[PDB]
């Protein structure tokens, strides 16, 4: 986006909204 | 003749002619049918409102004589594959009939729209 944000460290709220493969470290959304 | 009775009127007025056709309720047996071109002496004046106005007036006279004091109007235009809009004399006929002290019952549109149509005259490029 035009409004640049810090991406080396992401916010905890913004990580949970991104696609599971588009995070800084892709992690599954499944439990158990 | 008879006492007061209810009939129907099938006014078929296209861009070239005007039919004023009144039967009984069953629609099988007619009473009088006066056409727009019945009362004119020019082929271009068959669709004029005056030609249809005069035709409607004489239909009421014969309908009065038989005691048909009311009519169910079923108004139609040549809407098979061609223009669905009734011609100029279609509305004039209905006004003239009701002006002759004729009780006017149901008014319905019986222009047959094509559920599924066949080819239409003109070709691809239409009437140039």
């Amino acid at each position: 986006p035009l409004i640049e944000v810090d991406l080396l460290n992401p916010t905890a709220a913004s990580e949970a909204k991104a696609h599971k493969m588009k995070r800084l470290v892709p992690t599954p959304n499944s439990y158990f | 003749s008879t006492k007061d009775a209810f009939g129907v009127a099938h006014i078929y007025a296209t861009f070239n002619d005007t039919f004023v056709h009144v039967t009984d309720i069953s629609g099988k047996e007619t009473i009088i049918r006066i056409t727009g071109g019945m009362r004119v002496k020019a082929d271009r004046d068959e669709s004029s409102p005056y030609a249809a106005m005069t035709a409607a007036q004489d239909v009421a006279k014969r309908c009065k004589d038989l005691g048909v004091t009311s009519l169910h109007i079923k108004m139609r235009g040549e809407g098979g594959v061609y223009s669905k809009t009734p011609g100029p004399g279609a509305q004039a006929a209905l006004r003239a009939l009701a002006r002759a002290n004729m009780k006017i019952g149901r008014i319905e549109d019986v222009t047959p729209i094509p559920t599924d149509c066949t080819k239409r005259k003109g070709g691809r490029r239409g009437r140039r």
């Binding site: - | 009984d24 069953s26 629609g27």
Partner: protein, 144 residues
């Protein structure tokens, strides 16, 4: 006098027919005249000396531009509808949701009709289909 040979007959009596008595005659009468009320004005009935048909005005006055036309066969037609809180312009049902409607659109009708209108009931009963898609206008347009 070409009409001197005609003797009028009769058929609530809702009208008279002229003959020359022969009478596969078919007569159409508006339901409002038959039931002496103006609430059933958008209907027609046919009798043979037969059937019913939705009037042309009411058939064309219930078709909306931005809905889904659901029709089955006793012919029945219904339309999807908007909502009080709905915002989007288009309210269309999927092909699978229509089959759920059609699996009860006439199936409900054939259930009671075979077991056994002019009041309300079955036309409005089949609208509650509502559990699968909102529906407002349901009519039985023609019976053969």
């Amino acid at each position: 006098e070409p009409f001197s040979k005609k003797e009028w007959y009769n058929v609530r009596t809702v009208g008279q027919i002229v003959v020359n008595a022969q009478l596969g005659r078919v007569v159409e009468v508006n339901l409002a005249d038959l039931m002496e009320n103006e609430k059933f004005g958008a209907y027609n009935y046919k009798f043979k000396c037969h059937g019913l048909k939705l009037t042309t005005d009411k058939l064309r006055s219930i078709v909306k531009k931005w809905c889904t036309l659901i029709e089955t066969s006793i012919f029945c037609i219904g339309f999807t509808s908007r909502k009080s809180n709905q915002i989007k312009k288009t309210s269309y049902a999927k092909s699978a949701q229509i089959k759920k409607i059609r699996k009860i659109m006439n199936n409900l009708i054939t259930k009671e009709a075979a077991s056994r209108l002019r009041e309300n009931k079955l036309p409005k009963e089949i609208v509650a289909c509502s559990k699968v898609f909102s529906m407002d206008n349901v009519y039985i347009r023609k019976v053969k």
